[PDB]
Design a protein around this ligand. Structure first.
Ligand SMILES: [Cl-]
Ligand SMILES: [Cl-]
Ligand SMILES: [Cl-]
Ligand SMILES: [Cl-]
Ligand SMILES: [Cl-]
Ligand SMILES: [Cl-]
Lengths: 233, 233, 234, 234, 233, 235
């Protein structure tokens, strides 16, 4: 048995997994951080690797952009591959006026403009929570490394190119720290299946102040975040 | 003074415990607090200020449901300079592994209330606990040996619900317990830039039918007040 | 048998009851209007009393503030105590341009920003109606007394402190008379259980003109509202 | 001249009956009115003006459903100065004990329609009948031995509905009958500060299957027409 | 006999045109048909059957709005065995390049009606024209020289709209024109497995204010009915 | 100027473009049907190529899965690279009782699960339409090649693994043909920017009967589908 979008053999994927978004970031992580690495998937070029880190097996799996894409992969990892701990390491755009580029956000929960949870719970606002043990580990370890760590809510957006920004500014005004595109799907599915999830994101740019950052510029932060995510897993 | 509180300026402390029942606000003030004053008896919604471990702290009845607690939180924050707000009380467990006497620290809340859908049309607002407060309570509770569960809760907008299917499904998706206030607190605290948390003792399990008398859970309850006082001070 | 939020013995609560939000107003009503009074409930300080008015037993019960709070008490009064006629008394903020302080509003229906009926009838607007017999009795007693009584819709608001007043202004522009926080709960649950409800409200202030009244300034209008609610109820 | 009515200014009276079917408007004009002119034949949606006890009064056919009656009502009020509007119609009973030939005077309307959700996003809008017209009709209806009931109705967009589950549940919450116009009528009258009422005979029972013939309903219809005409002219 | 149509079985043709106005149905039958019979006078909602190019065909007034047309379409399908239903009439243009006298052939419709949300809670239902009918009508129209535009329309529930900002926004998103019926026709035809289409003449432009009298656009209207008739048979 | 997710120079991408979800499928199309081919992108490994087909420049670009992924690429293609005709080629699951595997669905419109359009038009059901000239072209070309072409509505889903299938079942009862995950985004944005879109889809499986198909079993049908989409895009 393999899932429809992942060609991995049963057992090839570790119980712990990083979800760095771009498949080429998964490759970067595997080559740079992991020993004895296997590439267990190339379907749709969505690279997935298993290797060893401090004597433990651990996986890194590219997902695409957005709730529907990540929901497909997460569903498959949990359901078909028995994956227990899932840490998204990614970027976000700040939407709160004093959040700064290079800040690292640990998502306690996620707001959304997605209908995904509306269908599951008609008439309810479902607010999916992070796994607290993962979150507290990440917080502690990020603080030890001198990362500009914030713990709070984010917005999981369906639309990267949004014509009206009024309501995301408003979410800004109620303390929502940043916007990204996957976290609600990851946290909601982890909760559904009784497994552990966390999103750890770096602010790559500010949506209102215009402040922006280069990927070279985010490299030192990103590398500390991958090590944090790995240790936590 | 505000429309629902007759306190003068300076009669209410910066940090405050927010039970629903005003007779529990009295119990807590008389039990835990020294040099207590009663600054409010409008609507019988008793509120007190005293000292805990030498430090000034208040306790205010909120009444039941989102709309009632919202009035008091708005007025405490806007008129009285309150900065730290901790809801304390009980809840009904709905997740399969949650037990009577467990203490729930809400990371977020789900709701069937329309208060946030009106504010952010088309969005699911996931209101978030203050993390600093939350880590303080968690750490205080764990040091004590309480079975502290950090996760989401359902803020119900109805107590006598016609069907339990949706609350059962929410519990299937990991939602720990049900209560009727925390999304209001978390949302307003976020809106005003102040710090909020909800710490709740499980009095019964809604699906297993495990129940507990308030006498039966008194020392757990006392320890919840303890950790909540520690976190606020 | 006692409900969860009411410690009354079976038979201690009359079939007709007034439902003020404030349990200290419940107490004032009982001591001011009623003979041979008993306080049947102290749980949560949510005072409830039974007394006699014009030779009839009638009750008075604090409900707290908002839909979720009144819905608990109303459910328990009907289900556990066989209460049959339920009259919400209290104040309201005028939003229609011709409504005045001291006017008494009798709610034919209520609009709301509460989710309560949206779970129950998804895709529908449910318009909860007052019991017409009660409504008529109170209107007739009000007009005989000389009160400026107005029959129309009200807003049952879920939020006292509203960031924007644009929508409540628009509702007032569409003839919605006043804003308060309870009556849709009462009307819907009364309808659900086949019992009779009415809200009769004194205007305390006008939200858009700024006209305000103190509780002392309107005590006489309020006391007369209570009399007509008691007359309608018994 | 409005877009759907060809009447010249002054040819339509202040007060108007809305019998639905244009052939009922013609029936009402010919049987009850004197000195009648037909002011409109556009879309065959016949409108007449005549005198009743010395006072001018109109009778205007409207179409089926919220969107059609909204057209006619808007143009009636805005273009022609109509201040009093009375729907004289029929309905289907959805409540277990409501009977055919019962006459329902609607205090409010529930709805299927989206019309009010666009206007008041996030709100349930509950439109109120004019109370003075309503009590007038109730009193006159009861004096004529009509089987009068005062309550809420369901304004439906869909005459032929897949699932009756929810309209059964509305009956269980005391909703009496289903029709297709009054939420529009009551909402627009409120918006423009004018007076409206719906008075409806049960022609069928949606669940028991009981039905009536136009002839079986006639003596009742004729009493309702007289009641509506008097209220119109007073 | 259905409840709103008094016709005998066999008196209504399998192919039918559906103007809103019954007097426009009268005009169509008198202007275009031989051997015409008026088969319905209930509510004065006139319906006719006559012969066009050797073929029996009907014309039936539907009145105005989703709820009216739905009554008529249900009955024609379920009681009278009708197979092809083509709505004819006028529309108000809202897209910037659409002109008066253009003919709109609706591929789909948007709507502010709740009819379909109620049936498919959580979903936007997009009703489809029957492609066969649509292609026939398009070829007939382009053969004739008419400026036929194929795309979407707004099936509006209100004629007198408080604000035009949303219909303006729909025009900006390419929605061609506004009318009040096609969602009902397309959804019901599709539900019962029959064939439907709307072909409409632009009477005016909502935003440019270009307008046309019924007399001024008569020739275009007449050619529109010709192509509808040809498509139907 | 490059867009944020595409590393192409201005003018490297043709005005007509095919949009498979899978980048390795874009590669297959380019290598198999195109001459003089250049790979202009692999940021995120979301491969894009430009080549020539019947003497005309045409491009092929992976979009990824779901409304939010395809919306990103389509926005950037139109706004950053001036693309004008856009055809999604893909597979779908049949949800209507008479639709069969290997049918090719040409989507007139899309129903949806997504809140994308409800946000933009509160209180409205927005129904986005294919470009009709593209649609008519594809239909004629596909029927000539003997494809099992159907013209109708589809469902654009946010969820691949749905817990309950009852609404999609009901949607099928109302004539919706199949389920996929992208076309409401493609049609909506295309119409917003005044450009031309179509989705042409091969049924790979049937949601309710369970009939399934191998990618080998789909290949002759998919190959023809690619050609009619190229034909329709360049004409
Ligand atoms: Cl204990
Ligand atoms: Cl509601
Ligand atoms: Cl007074
Ligand atoms: Cl009509
Ligand atoms: Cl993807
Ligand atoms: Cl073949």
């Amino acid at each position: 048995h393999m899932s429809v979008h992942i060609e991995a053999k049963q057992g090839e994927i570790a119980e712990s997994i990083l979800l760095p978004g771009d498949p080429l970031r998964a490759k970067y992580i595997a080559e740079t951080f992991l020993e004895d690495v296997t590439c267990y998937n190339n379907v749709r070029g969505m690279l997935g690797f298993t290797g060893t880190y401090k004597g433990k097996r651990v996986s890194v799996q590219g997902t695409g952009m957005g709730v529907p894409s990540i929901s497909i992969y997460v569903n498959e990892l949990i359901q078909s591959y028995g994956v227990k701990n899932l840490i998204r390491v990614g970027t976000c755009g700040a939407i709160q006026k004093d959040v700064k580029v290079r800040d690292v956000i640990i998502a306690m929960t996620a707001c959304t403009d997605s209908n995904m949870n509306r269908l599951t719970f008609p008439g309810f606002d479902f607010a999916p929570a992070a796994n607290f043990d993962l979150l507290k580990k990440a917080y502690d370890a990020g603080t030890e490394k001198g990362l500009h760590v914030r713990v709070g809510n984010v917005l999981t957006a369906d639309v990267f190119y949004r014509e009206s920004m009024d309501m995301v500014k408003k979410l800004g005004d109620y303390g929502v720290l940043a916007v990204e595109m996957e976290t609600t799907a990851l946290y909601t599915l982890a909760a559904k299946y009784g497994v552990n999830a966390l999103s750890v994101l770096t602010v790559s740019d500010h949506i209102f102040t215009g402040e922006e950052t280069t990927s070279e510029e985010r490299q030192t932060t990103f590398n500390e975040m991958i090590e944090i995510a790995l240790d936590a897993a």
